[PDB]
């Protein structure tokens, strides 16, 4: 299980020939942006194991890019079980780190998190 922003991705990674199913449908159908797909691939790409592992991702919450990132995160963790020696390498690549970047709340006086309303001197 991986997470990012509001997204949560439970991912079943298995040893069969490399095909993808995100949330009960084809990968290109779910993630339209190629960037998201590339991100998802990256854990399998740092290893030479894209094509080796079948991946069945199941996402919930957040938006598409965040969902894709959460899936990627989950996949790295799943891969780590298959061969523990690659764990360090995955960590170095920056896939085993849970991306903490959390949406800042709207503070009272400010318009958004940081965006304050205009100041005046006179």
């Amino acid at each position: 299980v991986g997470k990012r922003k509001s997204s949560t991705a439970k991912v079943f990674v298995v040893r069969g020939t490399g095909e993808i199913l995100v949330n009960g449908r084809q990968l290109n159908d779910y993630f339209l942006k190629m960037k998201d797909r590339e991100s998802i691939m990256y854990p399998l790409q740092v290893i030479e194991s894209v094509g080796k592992y079948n991946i069945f991702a199941t996402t919930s919450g957040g938006g598409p890019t965040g969902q894709a990132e959460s899936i990627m995160h989950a996949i790295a963790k799943a891969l780590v079980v298959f061969n523990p020696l690659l764990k360090s390498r995955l960590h170095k690549a920056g896939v085993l780190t849970r991306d903490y970047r959390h949406v800042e709340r709207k503070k009272p006086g400010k318009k958004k998190a940081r965006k304050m309303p205009t100041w005046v001197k006179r």
Partner: protein
């Protein structure tokens, strides 16, 4: 007791020599970010890649590499940065540029030169401009030359030398 299997060990060994692959071409990503405006990165990406495709079609050789070369050519290696100079004459100094800054300068010029082209779609205009630069024709080059000349004046205004 860890117990690593033989096949796993062999796989790890095979991996060890290979370096970790880069997630982005950095210069391209920077360019896409600069193009982008309202957190609408996807649109900027589409624009850029479409332009590069067009460039490739016009002149059949790696478009990214050609763009990088163009940037290298165009990017002025230093800039005559102005200073207050302790409340006196504003004595300008040549200052070396970071890679991003170098390519940022180039990109703005490229964008400007594209904006003079005809089409409605900016991506097309951009691609035409990139092809022209690859072939070797722009006012951007002239501007760079001028900048270099201005840097050459003020030789020893550099402080540490």
């Amino acid at each position: 007791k860890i117990k690593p299997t033989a096949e796993q060990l062999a796989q790890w060994e095979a991996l060890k020599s290979v370096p970790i692959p880069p997630r982005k071409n950095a210069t391209l990503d920077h360019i896409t970010n600069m193009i982008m405006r309202h957190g609408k990165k996807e649109k900027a990406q589409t624009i850029l890649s479409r332009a590069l495709y067009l460039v490739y079609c016009q002149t059949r050789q790696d478009p990214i590499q050609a763009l990088e070369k163009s940037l290298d050519e165009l990017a002025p290696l230093m800039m005559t940065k102005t200073f207050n100079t302790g409340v006196a004459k504003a004595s300008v100094i040549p200052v070396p540029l970071n890679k991003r800054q170098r390519n940022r300068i180039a990109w703005n010029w490229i964008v400007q030169s594209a904006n003079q082209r005809v089409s409605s779609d900016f991506a097309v205009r951009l691609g035409e401009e990139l092809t022209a630069i690859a072939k070797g024709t722009s006012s951007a080059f002239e501007k760079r030359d001028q900048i270099h000349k201005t840097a050459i004046a003020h030789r020893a205004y550099i402080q540490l030398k």
